[PDB]
A paper describes a structure:
Transition metal transporting P-type (PIB) [name] proteins are critical for cellular heavy-metal homeostasis, providing efflux of for example copper, zinc, and cobalt from the intracellular milieu. The PIB-[name] belong to the P-type [name] superfamily of integral membrane proteins, which exploit energy from ATP hydrolysis for transport of cargo across cellular membranes.
We determined structures of sCoaT in metal-free conditions supplemented with two different phosphate analogues, BeF3− and AlF4−, respectively, which previously have been exploited to stabilize E2 reaction intermediates of the transport cycle of PIB-[name]. The structures were determined at 3.1 and 3.2 Å resolution, using molecular replacement (MR) as phasing method and SsZntA as search model, and the final models yielded R/Rfree of 24.4/26.8 and 21.8/25.5. (a) sCoaT E2-AlF4− (P21212, with one molecule per asymmetric unit). The classical view of P-type [name] is that the E2P state is outward open and that the following transition state of dephosphorylation, E2.Pi, is occluded, and that these conformations can be stabilized using the phosphate analogues employed here for structure determination, BeF3− and AlF4−, respectively. Surprisingly however, analysis of the two obtained structures suggests that the anticipated significant domain reorientations are absent in sCoaT, and the models are in contrast rather similar. The compact assembly of the soluble domains and the position of the A-domain near the P-domain, placing the conserved TGE motif responsible for dephosphorylation towards the phosphorylation site, are typically associated with commencement of dephosphorylation, indicating that the two structures are trapped in an E2.Pi like transition state. Alignment of the E2-BeF3− and E2-AlF4− structures of sCoaT demonstrates that they are very similar (RMSD = 1.1), and comparison to the equivalent structures of SsZntA support the conclusion from (a–d) that both structures have been captured in occluded E2.Pi transition states. The E2-BeF3− and the E2-AlF4− (not shown) structures are occluded, lacking continuous connection between the ion-binding site to the outward environment. The M-domain is in general less well resolved than the soluble domains, and the domain is somewhat more well resolved in the E2-BeF3− structure than in E2-AlF4− structure.
Numbering used by the authors: 41 to 678
The structure:
């Protein structure tokens, strides 16, 4: 059941019922009865909407279009009524195709958090709903479960994925507090090995977590609420037309009906100037305008779709050109989304190949996500992989150990060599690793036996086309540029430098992104382009929200107004460009579609009929539609 077929039947009936009687061999009950159907199908839907708004609201333009059909029907030139009814039904169907907004992400957002939780009660562990969790409760989050509440760890250690909140799927090691009575009072002193969030996914170990916020006051409950209260962005052209009808419809139907009904000064029959007022009124129904505005929208959206970007409506399509600022998530948006091997720093008498081969020999046995990067990139650099190690063992939260060439190998964080039996870390290599950590490198130190072979550094590299699209967007007038990421500030600064963004903010929560976005939106229109769950509120409050189409979360795709479906950034200088020209195509098509009405309707009070109205109105409608179709031609300029 879809209502577009009534406009199609009015098209078939107008055309074939204009053809059957005239320049045709068809009877007047079959050939002209089609024109009878052309009044019924297109008129009956606009009629019921007219009734719906005339119950309470003041006026509707459908009154003007429908009575413009009806007066031509009860008078001469019924092709005028059928034509106006057909083209206005079609312009209504085109606005309905431009009006499609699913705007629902609550279904995906509700899945991030569980409904129930295990809570400790002395010698028992009860099951309660999360809305019945009290602050100070100890919930038991066991293996690979979704965390049900914000708080801090009091028992157990585990590697937790905080992707829905930090945007980083890189697991973070979590340890219990030293003193929980102290930790509940001093929430500002919670180290990131301790702060846990609802919606995170637990790792291998169970965690007792003391609750901090209530069920609705958690960070993820806040991002749900913030997304739900999004302002539905309205296109500047459409609300302009709403206010314009609010003035134009009653003004014209008052000034050109009863003031033109049976005017005493010029000779008229009391029954025949009754036709004279409706000539002006019926032709005053500005149908060129009702068809110009949605056709440009649909053409621009179709060109964007063949260009590889989804646009959910005309309002973001119009907003993309007017932007002054744009903000970028890092991981998955400006970066590829995976750590590569980017720095090798040998030490002492160790070669580069010894360091890389011992690293790949151990990381072939590990299952941490960095092991796979190390193995594939040592295989890239050396062409080969050495023989794998023996006696793999984990030092939990710090790294790994193995045995290569009858010597004991330790790899991991700087805290590992502070914790195990062998030779301690020299200060110079310590400082080198410190320098790598500050430069945004996740850093592993490698010892083989008595000797430190050295250190190695991995990083999520930016996309190759990032710096290019950044410079292009600066050329197109976007001098307000920033990075806003949940990753730490070293990686944010290093990627922002490597891409060419001047201001980079890391360590941000989703609300902090919303804060930065509102601060930019105060000075102009702003776009938030990202790919994660924690970017969805900043997308929702921005002037236009854009999601990375392929790698992105379903939450961010359902929330965003623009989708970069090729998952590449080179679609952004194209998009804004199209948006600018689209406004030109509607602006021209606005004034024309208005002007000719304002040009043909005073001319209708001074000697014009209903017969020529189709000829002017079609001449006003088709041409503007034709200009909108120029939007189907545009260039990439690669
Ligand atoms: F991927 Al992000 F902040 F969520 F850089
Ligand atoms: Mg992300």
């Amino acid at each position: 059941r879809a209502e577009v077929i009534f406009a199609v039947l009015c098209g078939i009936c107008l055309l074939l019922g204009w053809l059957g009687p005239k320049y045709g061999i068809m009877s007047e009950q079959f050939g002209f009865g089609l024109l009878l159907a052309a009044y019924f199908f297109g008129g009956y839907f606009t009629l019921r909407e007219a009734v719906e708004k005339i119950s309470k609201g003041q006026f509707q333009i459908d009154f003007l279009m429908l009575v413009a059909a009806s007066g031509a029907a009860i008078l001469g030139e019924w092709a005028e009524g059928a034509f106006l009814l057909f083209l206005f039904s079609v312009g209504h169907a085109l606005e309905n195709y431009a009006m499609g907004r699913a705007r629902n992400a609550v279904a995906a957002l509700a899945g991030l958090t569980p409904d129930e939780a295990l809570v400790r009660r002395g010698d028992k562990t009860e099951t309660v709903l999360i809305e019945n969790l009290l602050v100070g409760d100890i919930v038991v989050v066991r293996s690979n479960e979704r965390l049900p509440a914000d708080g801090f760890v009091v028992k157990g250690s585990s590697a937790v994925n905080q992707a829905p909140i930090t945007g980083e799927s890189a697991p973070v090691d979590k340890l219990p507090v030293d003193d929980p009575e102290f930790a509940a009072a001093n929430l500002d002193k919670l180290t990131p090995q301790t702060r846990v969030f609802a919606g995170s996914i637990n790792g291998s170990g169970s965690l007792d977590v003391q609750v901090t916020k209530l069920s609705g006051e958690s960070t993820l409950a806040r991002v749900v609420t913030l997304v739900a209260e999004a302002q539905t962005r309205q296109s500047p052209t459409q609300n302009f037309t709403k206010k314009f009808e609010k003035i134009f419809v009653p003004c014209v139907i008052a000034l050109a009906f009863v003031t033109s009904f049976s005017f005493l000064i010029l000779d008229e029959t009391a029954a025949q100037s009754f036709y004279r007022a409706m000539a002006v009124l019926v032709a005053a129904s500005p149908c060129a305008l009702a068809i110009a505005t949605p056709s440009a929208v649909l053409s621009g959206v179709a060109r964007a779709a063949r260009g590889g970007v989804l646009i959910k409506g005309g309002a973001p399509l119009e907003a993309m050109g007017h932007l002054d600022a744009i903000a970028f998530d890092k991981t998955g948006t400006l970066t590829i989304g995976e750590p590569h091997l980017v720095e090798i720093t040998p030490y002492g008498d160790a070669t580069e190949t010894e360091l890389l081969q011992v690293s790949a020999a151990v990381e072939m046995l590990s299952d941490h996500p960095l092991a796979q990067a190390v193995v594939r990139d040592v295989k890239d650099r050396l062409g080969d992989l050495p023989s794998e190690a023996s006696d793999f063992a984990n030092i939990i939260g710090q790294g790994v150990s193995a045995k290569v060439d009858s010597k004991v190998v330790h790899i991991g964080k700087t805290a590992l060599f502070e914790s195990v039996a062998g030779l301690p870390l020299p200060d110079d290599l310590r400082g080198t690793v410190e320098a790598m950590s500050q430069n945004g490198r996740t850093t592993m130190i490698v010892r083989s036996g008595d000797r430190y072979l050295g250190a190695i550094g991995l990083m999520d590299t930016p996309r190759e086309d990032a710096r290019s699209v950044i410079a292009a967007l600066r050329d197109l007038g976007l001098k307000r540029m920033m990075m806003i990421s949940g990753d730490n500030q070293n990686v944010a600064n290093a990627v922002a430098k490597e891409v060419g963004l001047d201001t980079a903010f890391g360590d941000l929560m989703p609300e902090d992104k919303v804060t930065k976005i509102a601060a930019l939106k105060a000075d102009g229109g702003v776009a938030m382009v990202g790919d994660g769950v924690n970017d969805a509120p900043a997308m929702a409050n921005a002037t236009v929200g854009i999601a990375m189409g392929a790698a992105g979360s379903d939450v961010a795709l359902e929330t965003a107004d623009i989708a970069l479906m090729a998952d590449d950034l080179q679609t952004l200088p194209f998009a804004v460009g199209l948006s600018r020209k689209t406004s030109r195509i509607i602006r021209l098509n606005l004034w024309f579609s208005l002007g000719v009405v304002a040009l043909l309707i005073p001319a209708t009070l001074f000697g014009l009929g209903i017969g020529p109205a189709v000829l002017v109105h079609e001449g006003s409608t088709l041409v503007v539609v034709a200009n909108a179709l120029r939007l189907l031609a545009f260039k990439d300029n690669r």
